[PDB]
Each structure stands twice: as structure tokens, then as C-alpha cells.
Amino acid sequence: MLCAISGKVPRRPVLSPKSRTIFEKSLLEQYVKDTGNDPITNEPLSIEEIVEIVPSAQQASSIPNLLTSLQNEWDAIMLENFKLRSTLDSLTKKLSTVMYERDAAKLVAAQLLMEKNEDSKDLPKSSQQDFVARGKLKAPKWPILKNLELLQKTFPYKEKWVCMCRCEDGALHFTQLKTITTITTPNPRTGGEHPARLLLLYPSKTNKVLREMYGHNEVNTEYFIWADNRGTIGFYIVHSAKSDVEYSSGVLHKDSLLLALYSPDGILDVYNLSSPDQASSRFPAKIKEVKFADNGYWMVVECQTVVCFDLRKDVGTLAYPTYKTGTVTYDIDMIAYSNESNSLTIYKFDKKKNWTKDEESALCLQSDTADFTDMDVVCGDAILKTN
Amino acid sequence: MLCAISGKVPRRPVLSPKSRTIFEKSLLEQYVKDTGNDPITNEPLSIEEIVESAQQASLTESIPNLLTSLQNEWDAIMLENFKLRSTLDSLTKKLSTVMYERDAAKLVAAQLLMEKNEDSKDLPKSSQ
Amino acid sequence: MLCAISGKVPRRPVLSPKSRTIFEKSLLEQYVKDTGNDPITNEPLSIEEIVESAQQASLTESIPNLLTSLQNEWDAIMLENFKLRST
Amino acid sequence: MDGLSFVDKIPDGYKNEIDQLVKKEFANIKADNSVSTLTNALYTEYLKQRNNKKRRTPDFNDDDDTLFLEEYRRKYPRIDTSRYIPNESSEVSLLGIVDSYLKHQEIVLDTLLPQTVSNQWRINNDYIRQTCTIVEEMNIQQRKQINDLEIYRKRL
Predict the structure, then answer these.
(1) What whole-number distance in Å separates Cα of residue A114 and Cα of residue D8?
(2) Which residues of chain C approach chain A closer than 8 Å at the C-beta?
(3) Cβ atoms within 10 A of the Cβ of D68, count?
(4) Residues A79/B31, Cβ–Cβ less than 8 Å
(5) How far apart are CA A213 and CA A265, in angstroms?
(6) Which residue range(s) make up the domain with C18?
(7) Residue C63: which of A65, B22, B74 has the closest Cα?
(8) Residues contacting residue A356 through CB under 8 Å, at least 6 positions apart
(9) Cα dihedral C17/C18/C24/C27 (nearest 10)
(10) Which of chain D's residues have a Cβ under 8 Å away from the Cβ of A315?
């Protein structure tokens, strides 16, 4: 809609029949009278050579563009199908090269396993040839759970009250009415408990929340992981259809991305918190206790043995087998591992026993390390003992 | 004989001089305007760089072109690409099962490489 | 289908990238070895310039072929209107 | 990485065995417009959009509506009868000319089937020699291994 001399909108578009370019009648006529030529190509052109005026005659001033539009959308359809197919076949190359190389690498193992086996029989055949009792009620005797405040303060759960006690002053700071698991928040003013079906959050000597076998505080300090005989864990609330059995304990790994739940059918189930999925299961009776080391790669589990797992290899690298012995509680200080139940024992993790206490009468229900392992604490079916 | 973009049998084939591959004019002209490069080799290519008969026997029963034939064409385009999107999704999932099982085997080999040679070493030591 | 130099059915077709035309490899190779040129346009061409992906095609039959069909329909019917506008 | 395929003449039990060990280590680790919206919806729902089922049926003594529908049938039937004339004029010549094109298109594919066949067997052919080269060397190693094993004993 533009002339090719001045650049104006042409009101009488005439064209030269030597080079196809629509000019305006006034300007082209002035160029021809100046010199008989076409302005664009400098060829021969005259006034009579020009085709003037509009063309509409026996024509009449929709449909054709609909087909054009149908082409334009198809043009994209083809372009899309190409890029979709490229990635299709280009991924199939990765699939094919992997599957081939997988079963190729699989044959490495078959060979390796039989040679390893041969080495065994060969060598084998050749070689052949304080104590505080007043925290909880005397008439309903027993402390069933123990935690220490990570930032300093003792928390116990009793055969129905939760108690906070100060080791320095030897005073009960609070008796909380509203217990088989307890957790002490690092903030010192929040404490958590659980029992035979609530989780309770306490301040004010008061219960601020009742959330409806194990209880663990997330690394952020803001969330609680729980396990139950109802077969679920909760943070969201999930169970394993496949396993379908009671969960007996629950602990977060220190980094706060994974956790473990023990089962009544002797499995240690490892879960990804974000994905809410069961990523691994460690087999090898009811799990009684699990504990993650602050080193971030050890896990200790109990069920009359304590089994040690390296989480980098997912392997059981050590098993401490006791005799009748009940292991009820496990905890790392990561230099030391304590166990409690039939009695209290502390092991050095480096060489795997450094302390052994049998002061409690009947079951020990909890064990803990003071800061820098400067003391140990335990609770029993009435006393809280410090060593 | 075919086009190297859509999978057509081109009516006006044009070849690029940077990578010898025949494309249908419309489809190669569209790519250059979208991003000025050769689709296959990713080399610099323009519209001027390009360098420029087929018979289909229209059926005896050729109404159907508006109704039946056109309907089938947009059915066949629709249900194929949807099914092709389904195929791409599974390849990526089956990729993840491949690489995980591969890395699982790597750990076995590494674990067994320490196992075997030390078992062999123990036999060499046994003699003493 | 044909070779433009000989006129036979080429058993090894290779298309040139200067004058777009399907030549028989054995024929065009000799043409290049005579003088480095394309036989039709007489533009320069070497043997490496001559050339013999993943999307599967199907034969050209009665979407794009259907769209070009509907052009023939309308473009013919448009001339039918002239026969009655002029008359 | 190394596992000789040609040389190791490896049972199905060993695949089943190794699969279990690999399985245990896996137990441990665990651009278009509106066009795309309607196309994906059509494929997902499994329903094609209905076309004009009108021209085929119609009815005589209708109204102004069927006066149109009638006049539609005439023009398209004349277009039809003209569309059958230019087909029959050429007839089978136009069809058989395209049949010839399809034979040129087909043979090209099967030439590539051979080119791939040859280079695929050629790669495997090179592998075979390698397998037999080393398999011997491993045989040599094991024989020497067993010799020491008993030699060291008989000295002691």
C-alpha cells in the first residue's frame, strides 16, 4: 500500500510493464517526462507503457484464506512431530545402549561370583589340612521414656504425665497432664509426647496441641514424624500396602531428607520424606529401636541383636548379638553408642564395650548422653539415674 | 524421495548446500524464519542458500473429500501424536530404570573386585 | 526415476547441490572427472558436492495432498464464474 | 565392564542369579497455538468432531431450507459427474504411472536394509576376533595360575 518513488499511499496505483513495481500516477509521469525511463531498473519506459487506474471489472468486490489458515496450522503440526520424533529415537539410542551394556555388565558378575566362590572352597579345604525417684507418681510407678534438651533439662514420660526436670537445681519445672515417647525441642519451652493414640505438644505448663509407637523431631525443628500400630507414619499420612503391618519406631536421619520406621515383621523401612516413598528396606522379631548417627552414614537397629548399617553401601557391617536380653532404646552420643533395656551398655563405635550399668531393678526404658558425654542418663520401670 | 522434516513426499523439494538433505520448500522456509539454521546439522543456513512430478490417483468415489476424508486426516493426526506423546513418556521412565539398574551393577562389580583379588591374595599368602 | 544425462533408470541416484537434478552416480562421476562441472547448468561441482532421518513417511496419496486438491476445486470453479460473468 | 559374549559358551540360571544380585542393589538404592488444546482433547476423550451429515439424506416437498439443500445436491452432483469424467479420460494410465513410482520408493528402503545388515555384521565380525584373542590369553593366565598354586605347595 505504498508508492516506490515518494513512499506515499497511492490513490491511483499505476505500474510499469518492464519492472513489476506499483508507483503513483503523478510521480512516475514526472519521471517519464524528465527522462523516458523506469526509475527502479533504468530500462526503456513511456507514458503509454504504464497501466493506470484500478482493475475491478467483471469481478465483484470468506473461503480462500480458510484453506490458507488450514495450511498454516498444519505447518506447525509437522514441525512439532519432527522434534517429538527426534527425541523419541535419540532416547531409544540411550535405552538400547544401556540395556545391552547392562546385561553385558551383568555377565561380569556371573563370572566374578563363580571365581570368588572357587577361592573359598580352595582356601577352606587347604586351611583345614544420682538417682531421683520422685519425678512421677509412687502409686503408678515407672518412667517409660527419656529425652534431654539438645540446647541444654530432662524430659520424662510416665506410667500418664510428662515431666520436665532440671538436673542442676534438682527441681521439677513442670508436670504436664493430658506416656511411652517424649521429645525435647531445642527452644527449651516446647516439649512433645506420645502414648497408647495422640501426640501432644506442650508449653505455661499447658498442652497447646493434641495431634491425632515412635516420635521424632525434624531437623528444622518445625515438624514431628510419628509411627503407629495402625500401620501408618505421619508428618501427610502414609502406609505401605505391600508390607501392611504395625510400625514399632520412627527416627529422622539428621539431614532431614530421609527417615526409618521399624516394623513388627522385622523390617527397617527407609523413606524419602519429599517423595513420601519407601526407598529401601533392611531385612535380617519386632524391631524395638532405631538410631541414626550424627556422622550421617551409620544406622543402628535393634529387635536380642543390635545391627549396624552403613547407609552409603546399604549393608549390615556389624551385628552385636546379646543373649533373654531386651534392647528397648538405642542412641549415639558419634563416638559412642548406648543401648538400654535389660540393662545399660555403651560401646565405642570405632572398635565396637566401654561402660556397663545394672543399677536399675527391672527394665531400663531410656538412655541418653549429656553434652560432650560428660554424663549418661537412664530411666527405669521409678528412677532417673545420672552416671 | 521423502522430506526430512514432516515425513512427506514433496511436491517442490529443495536441497540445502551445507548439509545434503532434501526438504519440502514450505517446511524448510518455515524453519529458517523461526531460527536461521539447518534443522539436521545445526549449521548456518538462509532462504537464498537453498537450491530448488508426483502422481496420486484420486479415488473413484471422490462430499467425501469434505466429510469422510478430511475427518479421517484430523483423526489420524490427533490419535497418532497423542500416542507418540505416550511413547516419549515411557522412554524417559524406562531410561530411569535402565540407569539405576546399571549403577546398581557398577556397585556389585566394585564390591566384587575387592572381594575376588583379596581371596586370590589369601591363597598366595596361604602357601607361606 | 530417470537420469537426465543418459535417460535410463539410474541404479545409484545421486543428487547434485548446484543444479538440483537426479543423476546416476557412475554417469555423473565421469562427467565430473572430465571437467569439474554440473552437466545441466555448467556451474562448478565436485564429487564430494554430489550426495546420494528418523520420522517415518508414507506414500503421497489422495493432509497436504488433500489441501492442494481443494485449491484445484476452487481455482477451477472461479474460472467457471468468469464464463457466466462474461456471457 | 569386560564380559566376553562370543567366548563364554553362561546359562539362564546365571542370568537369574545375577538378576537377583542386581535387584538387591536396586532395593538398596530404590509449542503450538489453540490447535494443540483441541487436538489433545480429541485424542484423550476419544471423540472426533461431527461433520455435516446433511447432504446425503434431505427430503422432497420440504421448505425454503430444503430448497437450499436440494440446490446443493445438484451443483455437487454436476461437479461429481465432471470429477468422474477427467478421471476416466486418463483412466488406468494415471494410476499405473503412480504404481511405478511406488516400486522405485520401495527398493530404496531395502538397499538400506542391506547396507545396515553388512555394517552390523562387520562390527560383530571384528569383535569376534578380539574375544578369541583375549580368551586365549586368559586361558594362558589360568594355566600358569594353577601351576604356581601347586608348585608353591610342593616346595613347602
Answers:
(1) 13
(2) 53-55, 63-64, 67, 70-71, 74, 82, 85-86
(3) 11
(4) yes
(5) 15
(6) 1-87
(7) B74
(8) A343, A344, A345, A346
(9) -130
(10) 28
